[PDB]
Swiss-Prot record, chains A, B:
Protein's name in the database: Meiotic recombination protein REC114
Family, per entry: Belongs to the REC114 family.
SUBUNIT field: Part of the MCD recombinosome complex, at least composed of IHO1, REC114 and MEI4. Forms a complex with MEI4; the interaction is required for MEI4 stability. Interacts (via C-terminal domain) with MEI4 (via N-terminal domain). Interacts with IHO1. Interacts with ANKRD31; the interaction is direct.
Known tissue expression: Expressed in adult testis and embryonic ovary. Also expressed at low levels in liver.
Ranges in coiled-coil conformation: none
Residue window of the full protein shown: 15 to 149 of 259
Highest taxon listed in the record's lineage: Eukaryota
Biological role stated in the UniProt entry: Required for DNA double-strand breaks (DSBs) formation in unsynapsed regions during meiotic recombination. Probably acts by forming a complex with IHO1 and MEI4, which activates DSBs formation in unsynapsed regions, an essential step to ensure completion of synapsis. Required for spermatogenesis and oogenesis.
UniProt-annotated location(s): Chromosome
Record gene name: Rec114
Length: 114, 114
């Protein structure tokens, strides 16, 4: 909303968990609540579903420990979690994703797949 | 949730608006959604109701332009908005308020009423 934050809505978020599941996958539901990726101008990164914070860390000095890769409208974050931007079409999601890459890339490099 | 943020729930938030209302008052409802005051470790301050950001600014260098006053379990913010912390009792609300004052006071001074 503000000029202090940028925000993008997500279709999905998945936490690498490593019985023993590999992923815990969160989706934007009417009940569950909507997924938002937030980047604050000081360089803080959050993912939130409604009001619970699923992810929260500084992007400052993340060159040292953080790896981001984009495949189309998804980002993978490693050192692990995975995010997919929403939209009514593949273009609209991709356009969301790219806008976010633009702010993310101010702090880290966003690589292409290996 | 994280170690990157502190969060407190609010009973009420009121925006000074100056037909011509003086205040717009937001409350924690089941429909409307719950009020959260968030302070991020880089010094960013937010109030949010569900996922809408009602307030968002930096506390860094706010000594120059920002005035905070505490009356019991409420804070008034001027240069204007007003916040009241929640709790099952007056003590619990006051205890919430004070915890927040403790992080706020790292950036600004929190005055007593005039």
């Amino acid at each position: 909303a503000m000029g202090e934050v940028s925000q993008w809505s997500l279709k999905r978020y998945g936490r690498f968990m490593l019985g023993s599941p590999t992923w815990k996958v969160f989706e934007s539901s009417e009940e569950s609540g909507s997924l938002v990726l937030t980047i604050v101008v000081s360089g803080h990164f959050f993912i939130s579903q409604g009001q619970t914070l699923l992810e929260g860390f500084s992007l400052i000095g993340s060159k040292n420990w953080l790896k981001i890769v984009r495949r189309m409208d998804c980002l993978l974050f490693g050192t692990m979690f995975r995010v997919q931007f929403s939209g009514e079409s593949k273009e609209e999601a991709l356009e969301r994703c790219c806008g976010c890459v633009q702010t993310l890339a101010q702090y880290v490099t966003v690589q292409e797949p290996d």
